[model samples]
Target: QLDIVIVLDGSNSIYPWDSVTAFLNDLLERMDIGPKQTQVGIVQYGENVTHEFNLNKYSSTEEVLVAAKKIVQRGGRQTMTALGTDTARKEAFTEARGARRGVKKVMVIVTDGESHDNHRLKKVIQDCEDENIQRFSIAILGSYSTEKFVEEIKSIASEPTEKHFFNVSDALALVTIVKTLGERIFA
Candidate 1:
């Protein structure tokens, strides 16, 4: 079994949240796991981390679909608050570790901007490695993304299992990017 948590950047840069919603809907539809084989959850981060759902709360695809459909995006400036770079990371890891037993734990963070707290984020990534939790981070580069910020994220990613990045030219690409990731992870 696998425990998957989708951490979304609910900050200002990801405006018109419909784009994200569409990507999520596509990803959920394309996921190829049975209820007995996989469990999923959602965590939205902007100024803070919000646990939208937990793995144990749903038992089937239908339930997950319902929850996903109801996720309305809100407007806020992106801050390290959600994980505050690493604060949210620690909280997420702690919750994920406590959720289920004997399952591979995975966290997928989708962000469009640089973090406010890179030092904390670095520490959290190290902590996750020390705890033996497999982590994956995806940076969705919008128009304002900078090379320096991208490099910063790359520095924390371990090679071989490096972090993923997508240069979103527009909202339409969101579906394709997420679908590709879903296939890679759930296949």
Candidate 2:
């Protein structure tokens, strides 16, 4: 019923990548993952983006967790948020990538700072919306914790921003919101 894609910013700005994996593990444990329940995918972004898995890649939660644990953070110099989002919208969500029709499309973006090429984000996000993609943005405030940066991240989320957008002081704080975020996504 859900096609959930996790767009992670694995840029150097997000230090101690273990926390991100930990958060991913914790958040996913609460999901009823399966072919018909929740088809999960991972798309990590840095100076470049990598598709770690496809939506229909695994058929069980245990399988997905194993793959998730295998994911190593590929630290890059730039945070190409727009590139990642646009890729997920055009590539990952397609049937060739295991994206299912009639299933709710959800994107959970985790990033520490502003996009190096944010100029494309607005149009990219609009395209996602046009396809009925629901977005949830998480802003890790450890690096470049400026008011402007927070505002920038906020725009990446879908409407009803209070429910779709989240911010934590740092990667370690991500664990605190795992339950809440899981609830929202499942809701």
Candidate 3:
């Protein structure tokens, strides 16, 4: 079992913004989520990062799915991926929020690669890696994605970048990618 918390990038220009909820819903259903199984949570962000819930909060698939659907994109002009990452690590993945002793502390960040403050992303991700959480950040290479942003996404992951980072062309592909990744991570 694992304590998994996901971060959904609420950037205003996210590719097919509605797909964030769909990907999460699909991922939740595929996972073995329960009190005795994997406990999941979500942190959503744009100009502001909000912890929709925490790892210790929801115990069943429906509970998580409900919380996921409740996430509305009231995103602001700025999309701060690093700020979202830092907030999720500090608040969501807490011992109080059901972070386990021996299980992996995983945080999967799904973003559209539109960040106003990516300068801090490297440090925050490293900080998480150096501590309790194993950070996994996915960059959705939208129509306007650049190579520079992709490099940052790779470095944001833990030491083994391949296992911790992912890139996709659009939101529609995220559902399938996340399903495959979830199986690899939770198996």
Best by lDDT: 2
Global lDDT of model 3: 0.78
Candidate 1 structure quality by residue, lDDT tens digits, 64-100? 7778878876546654522633533455445443356
- For model 1 the local lDDT of residue 48 reads 59
The runs of at least 3 residues in candidate 2 whose Cα sits more than 4 Å from the true structure, single-residue gaps closed, are: none
Model 3 residue 172 lDDT? Answer: 81
- Superposition TM-score, candidate 2 onto the true structure: 0.97
Clash pairs, model 3 backbone: 56-97
Give lDDT: candidate 2, residue 16: 80
Tens digit per residue, CA lDDT, model 2, 58-99: 989998888898898888998789998988988889899899
Q: Distance from true position, residue 146, model 2, in Å?
A: 1.3
Candidate 3 matches the true fold with a TM-score of 0.90
Q: Which window of 10 residues has the lowest lDDT sum in candidate 3?
A: 178-187
lDDT of each: 0.63, 0.89, 0.78
